[PDB]
């Protein structure tokens, strides 16, 4: 190693002291990822993993943080000999990046729960020899910075992480695992995944982080959870303040999900004088549209979740329809299972529960109910249309009869006189999927033909013999 200027703020005695440290690092040529992750993991460990003895804030003494930093840098420098991998051009090689990845991987405990909380940071790597998937990729980037490899940067999709490096930062390399059971492609490019138009690789519209965005990633990666019931107020506040610092300095401009995280925090505990959560969610969506060709799903899911929690049914449906309008131009691939699970939950649990409550409130006399609004019925139909279109040309199917039951139920929540008002053109809606085009006459009928809907959604050819 640490430079003298990096040590002057220690000891860190409060949240605001940590925020100062992040401010100073972010004002530097290159913020120190190793330092910052070690601090965050330290504070998270003593605020969420083990709060014994806590009286206000776990003081971060320099002697402690410098010793952790020395354990990291020693481990990396000792195991990665740079002289074996000459840098033609001030850029790194694939072999060098692979060696760093191997080093991190080989340092990890043989067996542990890979999905635990609080194993994302370099503090976890040093003290527990444990990291989660994306934590490995972050550690590889941290290790590369510590080695002077200024070209190696973190790349992020909505459910995976890897690195970019080399001439013009144009190379990609896998450095960690994804999911559970996937035979890894460590050392390879992501170009096959890009080419198959999976959600996992975002058709190539993934985030290529600069150092400032890598700091934003570690801040999103703070995990305030103490247990299933309980969050650390101190960590929530630290994460919120750190996200505002990044925001003010411009470093969330290209980070849609960080804006959604900040909006969620503001909904929980709003900061006087700051934009509303809704404004923040829409800024996330604008970031996606500006930098990522509007090919991200979470900016709309964050918005829908907010509307859902606030029982803005119309606005939740619109936002879900918007998520489907994104997913429709992907192919559903092996390894996209996380987004399939989220779509499944929305269609088959969340929406039905919202419409069930809406129907009770309608019986009680609500006015302006989603169930009386043809534009809400349009949103519902646009949601299913994108899911159907997503499925077209995919190497695995999406829909099955489990989805059909909930579709029939959700349609039936709207009276025919409401459903009949939606104009399906070849409130006005255009269908992109052949499944929904063929369902058009069934959708606007007084009595919902349940069997015919099922047959159309699942393309089941035949009904019961006997
Ligand atoms: C499963 O989590 C969610 C499901 C949700 N459904 C709806 C609706 N309707 C809203 C909603 C919100 C969430 C919360 N989830 C949103 C995504 C967020 N993920 C992220 N947030 C910031 N940065 C990154 S980088 C990355 C890929 C990587 F982990 F590195 F491999 C993921 C990710 C973590 C929290």
Helix fraction? 40-55%
Radius of gyration: 25 Å
Main β-sheet description: 4 strands, antiparallel
Please state how the strands of the largest beta sheet are arranged side by side.
3-2-1-4
Portion of residues in beta strands equals under 5%
How does the overall form come out from the CA principal axes?
Answer: globular
Oligomer: monomer
Q: How many separate helices?
A: 20
Order of H and E elements: HHHHHHHEEEHEHEEHHHHHHHHHEEHH
PDB class: protein binding/inhibitor
Keywords: protein binding, PROTEIN BINDING-INHIBITOR complex
Assembly: monomeric
Entry title: Menin in complex with MI-336
List the defining traits of the structure above.
phosphoprotein binding; two-stranded antiparallel ribbon; double-stranded DNA binding; four-stranded antiparallel sheet; chromatin binding; 8 strands; 466 residues; transcription; globular; binds the ligand COc1cc2[nH]c(C#N)cc2cc1CN1CCC(Nc2ncnc3sc(CC(F)(F)F)cc23)CC1; mainly alpha
What does this structure look like?
Helix 3 crosses helix 4 (about 60-80) and helix 10 packs across helix 11 (about 255-270). The protein has a four-stranded antiparallel sheet with strand order 3-2-1-4, with helices on one face. Strands 5-6 form a two-stranded antiparallel sheet. It has helices at about 5, 15-25, 35-50, 60-80, 95-105, 120-130, 135-145, 190-195, 210-220, 235-250, 255-270, 275-290, 300-310, 315-325, 335-365, 375-390, 400-410, 415-420, 435-445, 450-460; strands at about 155, 160-165, 170-175, 205-210, 225, 230, 425, 430. Helices cover about 55% and strands about 5% of the residues. The protein is globular. The chain is mostly helical and about 475 residues long. The termini are far apart. The protein has one domain. It contains 20 helices and eight strands. Ligand 58O binds near residues 156, 159, 257 and 342.
